[PDB]
């Protein structure tokens, strides 16, 4: 009977809430009161990459922390040498409605996808030396909102069809499927060990999945509206989410509940992108108010503002060595900040 | 470094060419329910000149238009609609005869209101195709329409003086079609401010003037944008 299942689900949800409340005798502020505030974080723009024609939806740094791929709604994946500003590649995309892009950890491949429901993998190390279409991954029934390489041969993607998918690139087959979200999955982030990954969806909930088994390990609630961005803490035992309710929230996997909230009365716009610095002490969050805010992740108070973008900040990215932060925006320019 | 700069300038010339191609094409978002006749409009536009989006290329007076029929996407549009804020226009197709979904016309009204008041689509113009005139006329003439029950405001609605009925059109048909258009314009004129405009049209699924209507509306949109640049509007 469906009524009995509903009653059992309500009882289980109440039990989960009580268990979470039992382990919540100490707040993050009381624990972190021993740590002094970082003060104002005055970043400055060092490089401004120009050449994208439309609003930029995604960028992704390289492991070398000098090369970065960027995806614009004009149908271009531009691969930038951030040090010298020189464009290293400019891949014309078959579909100009690209909403995400990834750069392979080995650096030999890039990925893109969007409203066409297809993940396109391009080779950066061809025999001829030019960029060509190397793999097409189809099987998602909703717009591809995020994609992340695990290695040269495996990729993890999230779609607007409420599902995530792990693909083997060599054969193009869906190695694993992840279901359970009731809203469009807007972002995902691989753990540092690449065995787990958290995804945020348009249902005010985040889900931590084990890649190997394909089952949803954990579910985190607390947001009020659609979750747009998500990212693991550098240690891999926590993560942060940005939502349309104009609040960021840091959750802990082992505590199975919220650790901290980042919001202000003046802020009435949703967060489109979040990223942790190398240390994990600062949380950079792009906003719809055309700005990017640096939050003291431990003290929850604002530490800085990255003003300078003339439109919606759609994507952030921190170098693997923590040297620079690249922010794309709907004004079609990437800005590097130190 | 010399080779890197050589590759960079080789990329820059191609990007200049891509800019020339990109600025010369007008992107259009075709949106609306499948029963509204949007697919018939797409088919007519294509014959005139699994996938998560369908691209249609056509040209009017050597001007290239690129329409995007968002197919194979879920009904929750609040996220993938944001990709179409920079398009020239959103062609919103309404099943004008689908009153009495219990009321598809009210669903279209709510969707148009959401599009109009969306913060990212607040600068995007809407071309409104009330695309069921041929069925609306038959419904109202036969007496089975009875719009008054689903719309009490139709009990006292008077046709505006400036309204121009089609030749040989029954007054009730004109009254009903302009009532629906007036509901859409009541939505649109509320907090319009001149940043984005609504272009209501009385269309049919097999009309051959839809391409010309979209072309003229896009020309008007571009002219109004240019006049807003000079602060003349």
């Amino acid at each position: 009977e469906l009524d009995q299942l509903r009653q059992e689900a309500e009882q289980l949800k109440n039990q989960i809430r009580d268990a979470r409340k039992a382990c919540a005798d100490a707040t993050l502020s009381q624990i972190t009161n021993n740590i002094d505030p970082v003060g104002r974080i005055q970043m400055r723009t060092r490089r401004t990459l120009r050449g994208h024609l439309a609003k930029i939806y995604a960028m992704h740094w390289g492991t070398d922390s000098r090369l970065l791929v960027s995806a614009s709604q004009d149908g271009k994946l531009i691969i930038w040498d951030s040090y010298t500003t020189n464009k290293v590649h400019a891949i014309p995309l078959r579909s100009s409605w690209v909403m995400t892009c990834a750069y392979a950890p080995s650096g030999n491949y890039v990925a893109c996808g969007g409203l066409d429901n297809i993940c396109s993998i391009y080779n950066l190390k061809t025999r001829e030396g030019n960029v060509r279409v190397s793999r097409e991954l189809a099987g998602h029934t909703g717009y591809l909102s995020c994609c992340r390489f695990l290695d040269d041969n495996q990729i993890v993607t999230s779609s607007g069809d409420t599902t995530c998918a792990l693909w083997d690139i060599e054969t193009g087959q869906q190695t694993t499927t992840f279901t359970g979200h009731t809203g469009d999955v807007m972002s995902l982030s691989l753990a540092p060990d690449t065995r787990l990954f958290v995804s945020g969806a348009c249902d005010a909930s985040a889900k931590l999945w084990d890649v190997r088994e394909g089952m949803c390990r954990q579910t985190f609630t607390g947001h009020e509206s659609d979750i747009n961005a998500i990212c693991f803490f550098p240690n891999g035992n926590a993560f942060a989410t940005g939502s349309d309710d104009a609040t960021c929230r840091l959750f802990d996997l082992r505590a199975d509940q919220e650790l901290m909230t980042y919001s202000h009365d003046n802020i009435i716009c949703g967060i489109t992108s979040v990223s942790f610095s190398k240390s994990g002490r600062l949380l950079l969050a792009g906003y719809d108010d055309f700005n990017c805010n640096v939050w003291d992740a431990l003290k929850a108070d604002r530490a800085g503002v990255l003003a300078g973008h003339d439109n919606r900040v759609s994507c952030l990215g921190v170098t693997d060595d923590g040297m620079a932060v690249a922010t794309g925006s709907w004004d079609s320019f990437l800005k590097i900040w130190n | 470094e010399k080779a890197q700069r050589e590759a960079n300038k080789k990329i820059e010339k191609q990007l200049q060419k891509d800019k020339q191609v990109y600025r010369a094409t007008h992107r259009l978002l075709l949106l609306g329910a499948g029963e509204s006749g949007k697919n018939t409009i797409v088919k007519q536009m294509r014959i005139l000149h699994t996938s998560g989006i369908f691209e249609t290329k056509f040209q009017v007076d050597k001007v290239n238009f690129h329409m995007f029929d968002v197919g194979a996407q879920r009904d929750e549009r609040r996220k993938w609609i944001q990709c179409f804020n920079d398009v020239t226009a959103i062609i919103f197709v309404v099943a004008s005869s689908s009153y009495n979904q219990t009321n598809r016309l009210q669903a279209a009204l709510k969707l148009f209101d959401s599009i109009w008041n969306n913060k990212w689509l607040r600068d995007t113009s809407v071309i409104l195709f009330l695309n069921k005139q041929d069925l609306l006329a038959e419904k109202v003439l036969a007496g089975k329409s009875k719009i008054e029950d689903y719309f009490p405001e139709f009990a006292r609605y008077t046709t505006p003086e400036d309204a121009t009925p089609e030749p040989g059109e029954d007054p009730r048909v004109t009254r009903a079609k302009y009532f629906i258009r007036d509901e859409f314009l009541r939505i649109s004129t509320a907090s319009g401010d001149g940043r984005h405009y609504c272009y209501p049209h009385f269309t049919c699924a097999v009309d051959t003037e839809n391409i010309r209507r979209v072309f003229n509306d896009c020309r008007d949109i571009i002219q109004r944008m240019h006049l807003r640049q000079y602060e003349l509007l």
Partner: nanobody
Amino acid sequence: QVQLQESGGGLVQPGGSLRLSCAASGFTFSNYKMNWVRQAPGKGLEWVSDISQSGASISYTGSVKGRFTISRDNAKNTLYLQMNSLKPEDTAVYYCARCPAPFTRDCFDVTSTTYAYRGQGTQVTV
């Protein structure tokens, strides 16, 4: 967790009166515009009414204008639909819906098939 629980529905004689109540929790009720949407048997989701954040702006579907009255108690974080002069066409499951973004005039996707911030609904049999 966004929780929307509806109650007050039940059997009623045609032309009778009724009152639907919606208890909202997990979100700031006053920051969100609220909706009543019903799903009649054999039919999709139908939008009945909506009320703004403060309650100053109100709209109804035409079929219920002058018959039902929507209201919200922001202090009590609840929503009300006072139903008067009911008709046999009103027999439906009523969902108290919330549209996702706060402080926004757009109220997208409240009538979607698999919408998230929507209640379980209460049955109203006229």
